[PDB]
Write a protein that binds this ligand. Structure first.
Ligand SMILES: CCn1nc(C)cc1C(=O)Nc1nc2cc(C(N)=O)ccc2n1C[C@H](O)c1ccccc1
Ligand SMILES: CCn1nc(C)cc1C(=O)Nc1nc2cc(C(N)=O)ccc2n1C[C@H](O)c1ccccc1
Ligand SMILES: [Ca+2]
Ligand SMILES: [Ca+2]
Lengths: 177, 177
């Protein structure tokens, strides 16, 4: 009994597979502007946050003030937000960012006593969710190239630094190959 | 590996548990009107259609012309539609009706070759989805009393007659106990 299997297939089949094909185009179009204006550039991939603690806030800035809302991404109806990642008050990167909503279900199940679903169970299923979604995106046409999973366990931490590490690695890969 | 487990928990935790508490109130309020006007009454439970063939049309009338859109249910934002069930052109019942959207995921997976998910698999998981959702609603507070699952296999059929059978049984139970 692994709720993560169905959660990952539902998230892919019912959302990612539908939104991702439009995204590269929406982002390029925006980047004409962003460039001419702030000489900036938004990464072309959807960055999906996968906190293993299944903590999804209503606004990213609350999880880290160095993650600042910049703009809504226009449509070519799906709402997607571009954020700037700050270091010492300076813009260090920009990207389309959002949390994987299925993790909220895992959180809610761990607080729903009738489910018999412990915090240990929640963590196990959050990891399984990440692995399954990775497997799906690996076999998937282009979708894998249109997004990046950012999974992290917080100790008992800077989310903006984690995202910047990925953005910088993404650029490195782009220019070296 | 059973995607139905996660589909059913996600459908409950992320939708049914959230909508059902408002529903009895929305329906009672509407029924003041419906009564004073057409001397009719809308059943107080959400009827969820669970076709085991995972065929979900964009409009109910296409699955059966004796299922006719009547009105949108007002809010106390969730969109819910009241339908009239016809027999020989006459109104025989009314209820809030909708398909269980997770079955669409099962359908899409059966057409997504990379999933390795056959029609046999789809049927097996559609049944498991129904059973799991029933189990969840059975342990759930009031939610079980605020909705009714209508699961059916179509041969190789009148959907309105299936729904009316349930509505009439529901009334019988109400008046006898
Ligand atoms: C069903 C897919 N899924 N499975 C799991 C598990 C988690 C998700 C998921 O995350 N879904 C989802 N993400 C969305 C993002 C936006 C946006 N970015 O504006 C808008 C709607 C979004 N939906 C909802 C979807 O369209 C829908 C389904 C049924 C009925 C109405 C709507
Ligand atoms: C996530 C829950 N789920 N799991 C499976 C599996 C199927 C469903 C499902 O059916 N979901 C759903 N049913 C909806 C009905 C209405 C209406 N009747 O207006 C509006 C939104 C509705 N959603 C979407 C939900 O709000 C949402 C999730 C993530 C992001 C944005 C929205
Ligand atoms: Ca956290
Ligand atoms: Ca059918």
């Amino acid at each position: 009994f692994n709720v993560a299997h169905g959660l990952a297939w539902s998230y892919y089949i019912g959302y990612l597979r539908l939104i991702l094909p439009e995204l590269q185009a929406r982002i390029r179009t925006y980047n004409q502007h962003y460039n001419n204006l702030l000489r900036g550039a938004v990464s072309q991939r959807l960055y999906i946050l996968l906190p293993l603690d299944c903590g999804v806030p209503d606004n990213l800035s609350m999880a880290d003030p160095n993650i600042r809302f910049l703009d809504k991404l226009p449509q070519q109806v799906y709402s997607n937000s571009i954020y700037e990642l700050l270091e010492n008050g300076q813009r260090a990167g920009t990207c389309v960012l959002e949390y994987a909503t299925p993790l909220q279900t895992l959180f809610a199940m761990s607080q729903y006593s009738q489910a018999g679903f412990s915090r240990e169970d929640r963590l196990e299923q959050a990891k399984l969710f990440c692995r399954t979604l990775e497997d799906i995106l690996a076999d998937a046409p282009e979708s894998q190239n249109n997004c990046r999973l950012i999974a992290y366990q917080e100790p008992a931490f800077s989310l903006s630094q984690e995202v910047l590490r990925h953005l910088r690695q993404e650029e490195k890969e782009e220019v070296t190959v």
